Each structure stands twice: as structure tokens, then as C-alpha cells.
Amino acid sequence: MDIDPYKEFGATVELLSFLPSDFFPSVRDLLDTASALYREALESPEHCSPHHTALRQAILCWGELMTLATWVGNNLEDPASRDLVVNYVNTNMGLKIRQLLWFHISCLTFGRETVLEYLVSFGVWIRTPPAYRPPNAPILSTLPET
Amino acid sequence: MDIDPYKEFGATVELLSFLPSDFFPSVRDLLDTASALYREALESPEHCSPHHTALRQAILCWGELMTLATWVGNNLEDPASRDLVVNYVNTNMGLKIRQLLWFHISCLTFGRETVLEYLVSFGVWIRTPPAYRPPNAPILSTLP
Amino acid sequence: MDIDPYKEFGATVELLSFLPSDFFPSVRDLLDTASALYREALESPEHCSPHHTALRQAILCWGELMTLATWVGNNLEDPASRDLVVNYVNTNMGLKIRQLLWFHISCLTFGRETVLEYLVSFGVWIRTPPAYRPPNAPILSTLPET
Amino acid sequence: MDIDPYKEFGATVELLSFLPSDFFPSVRDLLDTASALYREALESPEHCSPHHTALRQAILCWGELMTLATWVGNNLEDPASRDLVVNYVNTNMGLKIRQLLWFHISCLTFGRETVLEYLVSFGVWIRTPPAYRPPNAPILSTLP
Amino acid sequence: MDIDPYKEFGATVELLSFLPSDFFPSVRDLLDTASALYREALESPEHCSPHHTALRQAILCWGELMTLATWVGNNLEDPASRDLVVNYVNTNMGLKIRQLLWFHISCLTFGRETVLEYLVSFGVWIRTPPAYRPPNAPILSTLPET
Amino acid sequence: MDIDPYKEFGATVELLSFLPSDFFPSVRDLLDTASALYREALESPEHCSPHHTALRQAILCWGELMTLATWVGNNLEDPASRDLVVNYVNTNMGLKIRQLLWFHISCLTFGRETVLEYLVSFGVWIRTPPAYRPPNAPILSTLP
């Protein structure tokens, strides 16, 4: 139509595409982070922030894709096709699900503004020549003192 | 963690299960009604309501599954497997997307309280044995 | 002794008997309606209304009868007797459990008065000759407007 | 859904399990004590207390199981199966009815707080190894 | 170092040792008492009293020892050693875990002072010659009236 | 009942799982740091904080498991079984004791909020793919 999923958050899929693809943690790890942090936050009968709302749907999405991987693994004779599809679920669609979970999860943990600033800083920092950039890549601030 | 998608909206998947699987319109239809009613509402830089937000992730999801179907059509050569899998995307996984789309779309066109009393009243209309069922089922409408 | 279960609710077993037996939904369906509507309502450490209180006990009753169906199915050699009893659990005792769940469940969903009025209206409507009754049978009102 | 029957009354089935199975009086006895103490209270057109309400469903239930036993006696011809099943109604399913009846009947004769401190104090009396157990167990009474 | 577990509660391991070892209920029974009484009390994201705090850790301790009994039962060929260790877990370490659960559980149910007074009274009562002590041993008071 | 040990402290075992198993110092080290910092705090007739209380049960526990290891060394004669079991006490069961000790010890040296933002920030440092990870990991310190 189309509808950019981050547009309501002051971001774009092109803004998330600014970071290298070889950046977002595998979806099992993000899910692990969510369950560790916001399980009771999500399983509650109320939207807290739009970020939660987006996040639940994202997780249900990966849950449906996981169900798909199970059915495809269980119900196909050809191994070349079954392997190509089960691998496609995580390699291609998994990049989008990865950035999707990662964006809201970071947005809850730090803030929308902090993540936006981060996408910018890392997007620039990776693009700069090694000689003229700060020695270590930017990370997400939490408790930096004494 | 389980997290019921409707739980934030005062519902449960058990509440949606009251409706028969042969009830929700094909996803293409919900999408068309969505674009017809709430398109500018969705393509907005500001998030309007929680329903819009849930809805957008729903739509983007279905778009991703459609991309999966196109990719399955272009990549796989054998027709038995590609036909079994392209069908599993539409018939099986499509139900979950259908229920969500219908739930928010209807919540938007009428309201949450209307949709909920509706799920209950429809629950009564469906639970009734056929011999004693009213000639017409309840529907949502603004007149009525 | 005896104690009519609905008497505290301003009703009678004879009042529920006014409706045809071929009316109440099978118990799995009622349970489905309960779990869909009042799971969190029932699993809470407090009686909300007497209707809840009656309802929990009713459900525990059907749970005991279901346990009975399992033991009878698992622990008998004769198939004629095992089938006759397992069928008797739902056919005969199941009518009473059906009306029992249905009455409180409707009483919560609409109101005691609304259900009483309904038992009356349907009890009359089924008894009237087809020519002189409204074309469609009464149903339980919820949201009838525009 | 699981819903513990005593949960609304500030108890759990785990709390009742503190009492041994060889503790609750046969259901006929509870019924007799019930009719002796609270019969007019039960046959009342007005619901008195939540305990009465839970109690009535309990009694009506046991009456239904008794009807089941009579029907099993009249319908089945073979004695091995009818004797195994008529016994399963009294010995096995009867325990759950026994605990409920005893719990409310006792809650009525004394009170909830008395019944609860009782379940605890009895829990202590039973948990104790026999060598160190008091000559007499705790009981409920109004004097004492 | 050492740290007496009851010292913060106004007690000592020597104070618990005052009672005969053949007194504390087997750990499955104590756990049963805990789950019956304080399941919702313990599974809550807050320390209520230090007694709860001690108690959770005690239960996790017995849970680890139970896990140990499972691994030792499952992963050893020699039966004399496997039986000697699996029996040692409950016989020796189980006395300490028993008194540990029992002390806090009683401390919650009655009070710290009531349990201290009880350890004293029973410790004396068992030590007195039969002729000159009260006929029945002391028990933990709860609701003694009419 | 499950009861997560950290749940009372605003954490979960899932929150501690963010740290790799090859992260927590051997239990002897935590104990030594404990005696070095909070020994008089622990040997006190008054309970100071919930962390101290949880900590003492943790320490007494590990002491009991160490007694178990000594007893296994003195009782068992066969070396295959005694070596397999004495090792299972240190490597396997030791992890759970390690996490608890480290969690409270660190909560004491710095504070709960510091430890929690730490578990999160470390979660970010670890979740990152190696190619893009910062040259140094976050640590707790009072300067910094």
C-alpha cells in the first residue's frame, strides 16, 4: 500500500537498513532478551506503550514462522526443497524479523530517541574509514559511571 | 511466554474461537476493506491508536508471507512440494492473520465494546442447536 | 431433602425444564464459553457473585464426571456396559449439567432477570402454534443498534 | 482453566490434602449433619452465604451420582462390571465430594478463620513423627 | 567462616539441635506444607519477611539436592555407591534441610517468638524424666478455644 | 511451585542467563571476596538486608555441598564413581551457587539498580555479533 512499520516510531525500514545486516542478533537471542526483560510486561492485559504493542505482534509473527518451519520440516519428502525453505525462513525473512524485534526491544530498554541516535551513530561509524573513526564501535548506554 | 495477541484489547484467542473457521473473510478482502477505510490512517507518521499499530504489523506480516509465496513460486522447481507449501501459507497460516485483521478492522469500524458484545452474542447465536436457532445471525452495523 | 439449585436464583429445575431438552449446547461448548469469558473471573481467590460460585462447582462437577468417563473407558472389559455407561454420563446427567452451566453463564453474561425473562419467552414461543408466533425464535440480546 | 474449588474461600486443595484420606466422614454422615443443622437454610429461596451456595451444588451433585449408582444397579446385568463401577462412585469420586462437604459444613458450624487455623494446626499434628505426637489430635468445638 | 543460618533470627544451629533429630517431618512433607500455605506468598516479586527470603533459598537448596539425587540415580553403574550417596543425600544433609525449612515455615505460621519458645519447651520436655513431665508433648498452638 | 530465586530482587534466571556460563568466577573466589568485604556483616546477630539473608543461605548451602564432597572422598572406595560424583558437585551444581553468590555480592558492592542496568547492558554487549562488538565489555566499578 504500503506501510513502513517504524514510520509511527519516527523511523524507516531504510533507516534500519543503514546498519549492516550482519549486526542484529539471531531471533532466538532477541526472544531470550524479551522473555528475560518483558514477559510480565507483555503478558499483561494492557498496551503499555506502542512499542509493546508492536513487539507482541512481532513475536507472534516469529511464532507463526517457527510453526511454519516445523510443518515444513515434518511434511515434505524432498530434502533439497525442505532445506531451501527452512533455511530461507531464517536467512531472508529472519533479517526483517530480527530488526523488527530489535528495534522495539531497544526502544523499550533505552528509549526511542536513544535508539534513533544509535542507528545514526553506528550507521556513520561503520561507513567511516578505519583511520579516522573512534577505535571501538558505539554500543547502547545503560549505566556508565565510576 | 505465550502472550495472547488480543489480551491487550480485552479479548482472548478462546474468545475468537467462538467464531467458526469458515467465518473470517479471505485476507485479500480484509486488506481491501482496510485500504478502502483506513489507508491514510495507516500510512501516517504518527501512531493513532493501539489498533492501528497492531494492524500495521499484521499487514506487514501478511506482506512478508506473500513475498514468501512468490519466492516459493520462483525458487522451487518440483510442483508437488511447491504446491503443498504455497497452499500451506494461504490456508493454514492465513487463519491467524485473518482473525487479527478482522478483529482490529472491526474494532475500528465500530468500537471495542461493540466487537466484544458481538463476540459474545455471536457466541450465543452459534452455540445454539440448529433446530432452535434464529433465522438470521447477528452482524455489526451502524443503523442498524 | 431436597434443594433446588436455581431456587436461590429465583428459578426452579421445573423452570429450566420448560425449555425443550434439545436446546442447551453440549457441555464442551459451554465450558468453551466459560474459559473464553470468565477464566480469570473464576480462577480468582474471591466469589464475585453467587453465580460465579455456583458455576465453579458446576464445572468441577463436570470435571469429576469427565474423570469418571476416563476411568470407565480405561478400566472395563465388557464393551456393551462400558459404552452404555460412558454414553449415559453425557446423555442423561449431561442434560442437567448442561442446563446448570448454561443458566449461570447466561446469568453472568446478561443478567439474572434477563435470563428469567428469556426462559419464559422461549418456553412460551416454542409452545405456540407456528401460525401465531413471531417468525424467528427469541435469542439473548447483547448489542442491538444501528 | 483449573479453578481450585476452595480458592474463593481462602484455601487450596493442597491445604485440604494435609488431612489424610482416612479422615473425612462418609458422605452420608455429612449429609445427615447437614440436614440436622442447615436444612431450612438450604431450602431457602434466598441465597444466604457463599458457603451455602457451594454446598447446594455439592449436595445436588452427590444426589446425581447416587442416581447414577441406582441406574447402574438397574441397567447393568453383569455383576463384575456393575460392582466395580458402583464401587468406583462411592470410594473414588466420593472423596472429592466428601472434602467439599466437610469444608463448608465445618466453615458454617464454626467459621472460616477457625477452619483455616484448624487446617494449619492439624497440619502440624499430622506432620509430626508418631514418637513425638501429642496424645490427642486437635478438633473443632465451641467450648472447647 | 562461619555463619549460623538462624543467628539473624535469634536462634542457633545448636538451638535446633536441642530437639531430637527424630522430630522434623521429611522434606517432602514440609514442601507440601509450604506449597499449601505460601505458594503465592513465595512466588511474588517481593521479600515479605526475612523468613520468606530464607525459605525460598532453602527450597531451592532442596531442589538442587533433588536434582543431584536424579543425576546420581541416572548416571552411575555401581549400585552400592549410588545407593550409599542417594541415601546420604536425605539421611545426613536432609536433617539440616529439614530443620531449615521447618524453622522458617513455623516462624511464618506462628511467629519467631512462638517457635523459639517452642524449641525451648520441647527441648526441655523431652529431656525430663517421664514421671515428672506433663503427659503429652507440647505442640504448636493455633486456635485453642471452646 | 517454581519460585525464581532472583524474583524477589527484581530479576529472573532468564535475566542471569544473559551472562555466559563461562563468566561467573569459581565459587571459592566469590567466597573469598565475600569474607574480604562482608564477613562481619554476615556473622551478625541482626539481619541487615534481604541480600545478606539470601547470601547466608547460599554460603551455608555451598558449605553443605563441600561437606558432601569430603564425605564422598572418605566413604567411596571406587575411583570412577567418586571422581564422577565429586566433579558433578563442583562443575554442575556449582553454577547455580555461583550465579546467586555473584548476584548478591555484586548487588551489595554496587546496588540493585546498578546490577540490573548491568545485566541489561551486558546483555547488549553479549548479544552483539563479534564483528561489531566493542573492544571492551562493560564492568561494574565505582569511579569508573
Residue numbers in the entry:
A (entry chain C), C (entry chain C), E (entry chain C): 1 to 146
B (entry chain D), D (entry chain D), F (entry chain D): 1 to 144
Quote the authors verbatim.
The virus consists of a host-derived lipid envelope containing surface proteins known as HBV surface antigen (HBs), a nucleocapsid containing a core protein known as HBV core antigen (HBc) and a partially double-stranded DNA genome. HBc consists of two distinct domains: an N-terminal assembly domain (residues 1-149) and a basic, C-terminal ARD (residues 150-183 or 150-185, depending on the strain). A dimer of HBc molecules is formed through a four-helix bundle which contains two long helices from each monomer.
Here, by using single particle cryoEM, we determined the three-dimensional (3D) structure of HBV cores assembled from full-length HBc (i.e., full-length core) to 3.5Å resolution and built an ab initio atomic model, revealing differences from the crystal structure of the truncated core. Due to the T=4 icosahedral symmetry of HBV core, each asymmetric unit of the full-length core contains four structurally unique, non-symmetrically related HBc molecules, denoted as A, B, C, and D. The atomic model of the asymmetric unit contains residues 1-143 of molecule A, residues 1-146 of molecules B and C, and residues 1-144 of molecule D. Unlike the single-shelled structural organization of truncated HBV core, which were determined previously by cryoEM and X-ray crystallography, our cryoEM reconstruction of full-length HBV core revealed a ~360Å icosahedral capsid with a double-layer structure. Overall, the atomic models of the four HBc molecules derived from our cryoEM reconstruction are similar to their corresponding models determined by X-ray crystallography, with rmsd values of 0.737Å, 0.726Å, 0.667Å, and 0.677Å for the Cα atoms of molecules A, B, C, and D, respectively. Second, among the four conformers of the asymmetric unit, molecules B and C both have their C-terminal segments oriented differently in the cryoEM structures of the full-length core as compared to those solved by X-ray crystallography of the truncated core. The outer and inner layers are connected by densities around the 2-fold axes. These connecting densities are superimposable with, or in close proximity to, the newly resolved C-terminal residues of the assembly domain of molecules B, C and D in the cryoEM structure, indicating that the connecting densities are the linker region (residues 140-149) of the core assembly domain.
